[PDB]
Amino acid sequence: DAMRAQFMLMLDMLRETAQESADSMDANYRWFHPAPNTLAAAVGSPRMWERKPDGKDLNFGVVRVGVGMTRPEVTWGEPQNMPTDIELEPVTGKALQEFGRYQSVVYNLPKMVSLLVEPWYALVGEREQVLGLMRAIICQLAFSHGPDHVQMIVVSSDLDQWDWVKWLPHFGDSMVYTSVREFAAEQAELFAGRGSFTPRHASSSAQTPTPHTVIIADVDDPQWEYVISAEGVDGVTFFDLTGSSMWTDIPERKLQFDKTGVIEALPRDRDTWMVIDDKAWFFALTDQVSIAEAEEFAQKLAQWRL
């Protein structure tokens, strides 16, 4: 009993050490990626348009999509001289096992997606879920990055939904289209000129040209096949709000929304963004804003210039 007691006691002091490191990560990630409703008040603060592309800033091109599970910064060393299966004492056995199961992940952290990792991101679900997340992504990009680094395009028939876009400066030009035939005449003339998609990383960020392009697809026109079958172009990223079969043919680029608003996707590494499994699983709880809330945010941002 004395040995059992001392073992339990030594286990809890490790727990405290784990929890302290966990607090540091909560404070750090929030400081770089706050929730969308708080950004409106921060517009005047120096945190706005703070991100840099110059290699050392690993957060460039990263956008917050919601909350979920993540792997902590701790690195566990396996126990030496592990007794064989028939030799393990029952009380301490489950303790070290359950300790390992729960203390290996930390709950309620902000999840993110990187534009530098995929040609497109297919959103599949009901209209409200799809449009809500897109509005959230747009405003997050708009607060952290300046117009000298990001430009945005929308192709949609339901113009009543994209009306609020008018106030944001990132949608300017030296810009909403009704169909691919229209988009092809004006915009594709510029973008088809060079390249094909190539996944990047932080060190590579210093070499890519400064203006990154975000394209929103909401028309389901079959004419998109020309750029899509060519596997896109570098410096561009498409978001399909319709869920057309041409975009939906790659699980590694498909995000599925449940009735509860939970998003499921293939798991990706926190440090390399590489896909780690071929089966879809829980990813994040969706964050979203209304049309009124988006326009309010855009108006506050519209007051400023370089």
Partner: protein, 352 residues
């Protein structure tokens, strides 16, 4: 409740069916109102209202049944009354899941009282014997209290040989549960379902224990103050038993850190001495007796206030701290050997 009172006073003097028959409808009416209130209630304020009414309905229902048997009021009426009271309180608690404390207190005094009256009914056993036995059951119940309270609150302890398998450190973690609010319709997730229950089981556990201590407290004071008697032969025997019992309870408090839990233990120890002092002055009244009782009744609590003020700011050596601990064990040891002496069991065996 006041209505049930006068009806009770009548039944205590007259052998007519009036009280049982006339009270039954009164209870049914309040109970009916309570049922509707519980259905229509949605807010916390409503629940408070609903709970008060429901609690009030159990009283008439209890005395009505107790008054059902014919003839002089006695042993069987008590069995019926405390019996339905026990079932009603337990039943109210199970489905309501609120007001855990007050209902639990009712269940214990009912249950033990039911077992007391039943013995007097089935066998011609004296009160002396019937009370001493209740004292012993309550003494062991205090040691059981922290454990008995673990079961009712739903704490479970897993033990299995790791599924007959080696460990898997990289097992897929459990899915976090999503939660919402009526006004704040936007959902948020807080954590694994397995862990959230503990934070709820614990709050529930604290309440069962607090009630269980209170119910037992009432029983020891009622039994002890009945065993000691100023006319009965060997006057000092039942009184010495009251002394050790008080000492044991008074020291046991420092095992409990909670504010209301600790005071109830300390209070239980002090009130027993005071209660015996009054009983010992009224009967067999005399100048020396009232002179003595008046002194004890004022010096005892006075010393207590003195101790409470000075102990928290003074230092004591290990040889003394170790000495007070041993008083507790020394107080517990004599209870069983003495209770049987008061019950004459040893003399009963020696003369077979």
């Amino acid at each position: 409740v006041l209505a049930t009172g006068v009806l009770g006073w009548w039944r205590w003097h007259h052998n007519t069916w009036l009280t049982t028959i006339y009270t039954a409808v009164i209870g049914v009416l309040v109970l009916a109102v309570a049922m509707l209130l519980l259905m229509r209630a949605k807010t916390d304020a409503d629940r408070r209202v609903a709970d008060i009414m429901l609690m009030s309905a159990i009283m008439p229902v209890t005395v009505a049944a107790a008054a059902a048997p014919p003839g002089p009021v006695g042993s069987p009426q008590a069995v019926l009354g405390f019996g339905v009271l026990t079932v009603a309180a337990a039943l109210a608690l199970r489905f309501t899941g609120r007001r855990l404390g007050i209902y639990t207190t009712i269940v214990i005094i009912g249950a033990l009282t039911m077992l007391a009256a039943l013995a007097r009914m089935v066998a011609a056993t004296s009160a002396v014997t019937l009370l001493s036995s209740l004292l012993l059951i309550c003494v062991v119940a205090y040691h059981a209290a922290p454990a008995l309270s673990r079961r009712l609150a739903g704490i479970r302890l897993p033990v299995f040989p790791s599924a007959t398998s080696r460990w898997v450190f990289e097992a897929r973690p459990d899915l976090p549960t999503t939660v919402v609010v009526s006004g704040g319709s936007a959902p948020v997730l807080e954590g694994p379902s397995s862990v959230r229950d503990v934070l709820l089981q614990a709050e529930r556990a604290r309440s069962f224990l607090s009630g269980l201590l209170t119910g037992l407290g009432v029983m020891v004071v009622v039994c002890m103050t009945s065993l000691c008697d100023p006319h009965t032969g060997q006057r000092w025997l039942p009184l010495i038993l009251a002394g050790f019992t008080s000492g044991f309870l008074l020291l046991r408090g420092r095992s409990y850190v909670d504010r209301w839990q600790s005071i109830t233990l300390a209070g239980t120890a002090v009130i027993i001495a005071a209660a015996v002092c009054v009983r010992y002055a009224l009967e067999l009244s005399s100048p020396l007796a009232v002179s003595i009782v008046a002194a004890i009744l004022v010096l005892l609590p006075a010393a207590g206030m003195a101790a409470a003020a000075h102990v928290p700011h003074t230092i004591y050596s290990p040889l003394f701290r170790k000495f007070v601990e041993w008083i507790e064990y020394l107080c517990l040891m004599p209870i069983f050997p003495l209770a049987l002496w008061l019950m004459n069991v040893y003399a009963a065996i020696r003369y077979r």
